[PDB]
């Protein structure tokens, strides 16, 4: 038997998105299993090259968890996302990351 | 008042050659220590990560740990490979200790195979979770009868080292751990739930101790409907949390975000809702 959980993507700023002003984007990719799994930042479409991220961990359900975060200054015409590839999901799955929000 | 100290390990077993390994140590859920794997160490994320242990004694449970990592591994692929269909799999470890109100200490071993619980270790005994029964039953059996020392080495470990070695890391730590952070707050306007419907969401970043209260209210009366998100972490141990509430436009005015924090030191975070009221 095992056990297959689909992740959880959140992606959200550490400061208010001013236009200009340096920022970090975050992407909690959390509540996924196997362990496997293929994160990217995007910005503008193509893969963010400088790119940290935590270390591999799980929660009590044995689920696991990741922060990967970048630095970056957002501007009016950019378009940040976060792509996670997994074996839950058929093909990866793109979440924007909403200035506005 | 409660506190932990964890060790956490994944192995992903690929097939009866190749197999990865990853720890990690854990104070509550501020990640201390990382293991490289190459070099087979430990990793001190922080100045104070040592926790008042001699270098000799940390080099001496890095021995321990690549030895039981040998181990681990030898005796689970020599099991695999006479099931060589079973991989890929992954093998979960658990261990530590908590820390209870008083001064208590509850160490505990816990064992998950591909993220269901496969066995944990109570008291003195191993004890299969119930479900997941045959590869549990056999595991706990080979844990309680051939190893030898390896039960007595986990007990010592989870029982005496990991609650002398928590204290240890909290009197190393003591500035870091209590310290206070004070969050950052913003307002924004999310997705219109509908025609004249208005989404106000309130942003709270950058804040440790985890513990918040976020809520949105006119004056005293916290309204209802507020939807709260998860505590989301920041990179460097601090956390973001985002509530948000749907009101009538026209309504929207007089509402207003209110935070409370520790850090805080009782004058509480108040942020109204402006939009477009404010030349
Ligand atoms: C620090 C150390 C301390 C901790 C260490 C303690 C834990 C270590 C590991 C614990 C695991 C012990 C429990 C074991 C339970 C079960 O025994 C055993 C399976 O049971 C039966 O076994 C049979 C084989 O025997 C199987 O049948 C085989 O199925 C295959 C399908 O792939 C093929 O059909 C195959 O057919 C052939 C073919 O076609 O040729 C015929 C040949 O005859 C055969 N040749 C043989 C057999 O010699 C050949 C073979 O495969 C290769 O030789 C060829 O290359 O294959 C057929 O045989 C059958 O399914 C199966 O149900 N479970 C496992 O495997 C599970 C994987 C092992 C580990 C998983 C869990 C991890 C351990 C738990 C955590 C670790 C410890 C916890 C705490 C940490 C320390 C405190
Ligand atoms: C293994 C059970 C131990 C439980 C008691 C631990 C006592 C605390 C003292 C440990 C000091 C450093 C803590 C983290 C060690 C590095 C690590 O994360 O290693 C994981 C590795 O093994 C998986 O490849
Ligand atoms: C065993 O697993 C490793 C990890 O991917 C791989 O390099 C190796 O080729 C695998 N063996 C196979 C596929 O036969
Ligand atoms: O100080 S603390 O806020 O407890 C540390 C939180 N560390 C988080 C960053 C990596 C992702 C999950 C855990
Ligand atoms: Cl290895
Ligand atoms: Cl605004």
């Excluded at chain 2, 509550?28 to 794997?37: F, P, V, Y």
């Excluded at chain 2, 070695?165 to 707050?185: C, I, N, S, T, W």
Aim: with cysteine; net charge negative.
């Amino acid at each position: 038997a095992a056990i297959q959980r689909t992740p959880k993507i959140q992606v959200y700023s550490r400061h208010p998105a001013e236009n200009g002003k340096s920022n970090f984007l975050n992407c909690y990719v959390s509540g996924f299993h196997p362990s496997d799994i293929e994160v990217d930042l995007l910005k503008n479409g193509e893969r963010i090259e400088k790119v940290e991220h935590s270390d591999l961990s799980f929660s009590k359900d044995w689920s696991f968890y990741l922060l990967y975060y970048t630095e970056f200054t957002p501007t009016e015409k950019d378009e940040y996302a976060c792509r996670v590839n997994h074996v839950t999901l058929s093909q990866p799955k793109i979440v924007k990351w909403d200035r506005d929000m | 008042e409660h506190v932990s100290f964890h060790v956490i390990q994944i192995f992903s077993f690929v097939n009866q050659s190749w197999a990865r390994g990853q720890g990690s140590g854990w104070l509550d859920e501020l990640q201390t220590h990382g293991w490289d794997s190459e070099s087979g160490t430990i990793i001190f994320l922080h100045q104070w990560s040592k926790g008042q242990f001699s270098n000799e004694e940390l080099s001496d449970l890095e021995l321990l740990f690549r030895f039981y990592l040998f181990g681990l591994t030898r005796e689970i692929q020599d099991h695999a490979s006479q099931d060589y269909s079973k991989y890929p799999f992954e093998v979960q470890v658990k261990a530590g200790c908590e820390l209870h109100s008083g001064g208590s200490p509850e160490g505990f071993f816990q064992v998950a195979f591909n993220g269901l619980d496969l066995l944990s270790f109570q008291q003195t005994t191993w004890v299969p979770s119930p479900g997941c029964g045959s590869l549990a039953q056999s595991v706990c059996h080979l844990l309680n009868h051939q190893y030898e020392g390896v039960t007595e080495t986990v007990y010592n470990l989870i029982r005496s080292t990991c609650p002398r070695f928590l204290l240890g890391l909290l009197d190393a730590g003591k500035m870091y751990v209590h310290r206070q952070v004070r969050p950052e707050a913003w307002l924004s306007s999310g997705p219109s739930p509908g025609p004249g419907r208005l989404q106000l969401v309130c942003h709270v970043s950058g804040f440790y101790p985890k513990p918040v209260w976020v809520m949105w209210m006119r004056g005293e009366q916290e309204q209802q409907g507020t939807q709260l998100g998860d505590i989301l972490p920041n990179a460097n141990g601090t956390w973001y949390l985002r509530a948000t509430l749907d009101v009538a436009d026209g309504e929207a005015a007089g509402l207003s975000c209110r935070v409370k924090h520790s850090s805080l030191e009782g004058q509480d975070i108040i942020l109204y809702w402006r939009g477009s009221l404010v030349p």
